[PDB]
Design a protein around this ligand. Sequence first.
Ligand code: RAL
Ligand code: RAL
Lengths: 223, 221, 15, 15
Amino acid sequence: LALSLTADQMVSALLDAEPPILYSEYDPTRPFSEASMMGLLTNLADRELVHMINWAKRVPGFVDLTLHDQVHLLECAWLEILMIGLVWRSMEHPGKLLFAPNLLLDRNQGKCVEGMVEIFDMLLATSSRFRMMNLQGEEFVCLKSIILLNSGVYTFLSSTLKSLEEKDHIHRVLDKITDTLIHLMAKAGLTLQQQHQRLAQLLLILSHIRHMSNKGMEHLYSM
Amino acid sequence: SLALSLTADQMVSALLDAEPPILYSEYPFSEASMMGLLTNLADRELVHMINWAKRVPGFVDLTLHDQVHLLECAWLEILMIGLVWRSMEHPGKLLFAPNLLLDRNQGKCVEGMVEIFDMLLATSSRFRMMNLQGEEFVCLKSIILLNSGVYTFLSSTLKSLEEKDHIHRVLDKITDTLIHLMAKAGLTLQQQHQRLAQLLLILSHIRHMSNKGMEHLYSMK
Amino acid sequence: DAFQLRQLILRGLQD
Amino acid sequence: DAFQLRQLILRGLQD
Ligand SMILES: O=C(c1ccc(OCCN2CCCCC2)cc1)c1c(-c2ccc(O)cc2)sc2cc(O)ccc12
Ligand SMILES: O=C(c1ccc(OCCN2CCCCC2)cc1)c1c(-c2ccc(O)cc2)sc2cc(O)ccc12
């Protein structure tokens, strides 16, 4: 099914696959009560993860893989995926991270948790970068699926025949998502040159996201 | 700005000419002696990487503070992409140096090293399967230098705005160069955009390996 | 901690 | 070697 989709179809599938936007447990009518930043963020991350799994099943190509590899992809990607979602919804709120529509946090709330401000700044810098680029919703959903499919692909087994087939299938779906990205850009008026340039810009941001995710795990594990 | 005036052919030449020398190791293992040999090599490569960075178009236009920062963020990625490139014609093996060629069982000599060896081998395989060309390699290595620290300068400062703009413009030139190599080699537009995406997606795997590497190295100290 | 993640994912993918 | 990296980088760039 996945390799037979046209670009318009792929975009639709991805838009339709989106998980719900979640609200925090924070009650802004009780601002002087004891609230735990990490508690609230943890509660949110854990509830998003439940929805992320169901979203992964709706990404074309994903359920064609074995169960073990489906698990592995999410295990390697989940924090990147949380982070790119944060960054996307934070685009229209410069200087702030919109963890939830009722939990919009200023940069300086990073300082409330030891070692968190560095990662906040990195998240804010990424949100800025999307803003400066006018990242479109269609492009965002393509990027989020690339993350899922690409982050664990290099660390399966290797020299086994099954992995060869699994990787081949992922690479073919990734090729389809690239075609889709280029198609959005061409449809929006960009020159070939401008198309390849923007595609490169977007994919180079993905390695920053990988970096943030690794720094994040490192910070989380240490709590 | 010399860098933004270059044609694709000129960029490729500059990058090919910039290449550092291929170093030999000083080479019955242990964790200590192998790490000794690999440390010696990494440190000597780093001296040459610095000189190489100065020859990458755009790089010396940046401030000294940012030149430092870029290399500080990128150096292990750059060592790793070099390794993986010279290992391409040696499946199952990593060619740290022409006289130092190691398989995954020697990885096991150092606690926590095999996992990263396997990742490096998987990347070298991937380049083999793609027939990565030397011209493409030199472009990817410069992208790593210029891209890895660009998001973590200061921000909301006027100077940083100017620095990032300059880096983005050079990165656009290197993209144009990659597409040019592909178009010259016969690929369709579709095949061009697809290969470009494939190459840049591999860069996030290299970032990941570098972060895992730092994590492993720090834990020996 | 790392077990709790695998459990969650395995639960979600199956039903 | 977190301090020794930056110095090694610094010396190589200015010479
Ligand atoms: O605050 C969190 C967060 C909190 C707890 C997390 O994990 C808790 C453990 N949980 C156990 C079951 C498996 C899933 C994770 C993950 C993210 C979020 C982030 C973060 C930022 C910096 C940093 O150093 C670490 C994390 S980013 C983020 C985006 C969201 O949409 C939600 C929460 C978050
Ligand atoms: O073994 C090394 C290595 C050894 C010591 C290093 O650093 C020593 C500290 N030194 C202090 C001064 C600043 C520069 C680094 C770096 C890499 C190499 C790598 C590595 C692989 C797996 C892993 O888990 C960790 C590292 S990859 C690599 C590529 C090379 O071309 C050379 C050495 C290497």
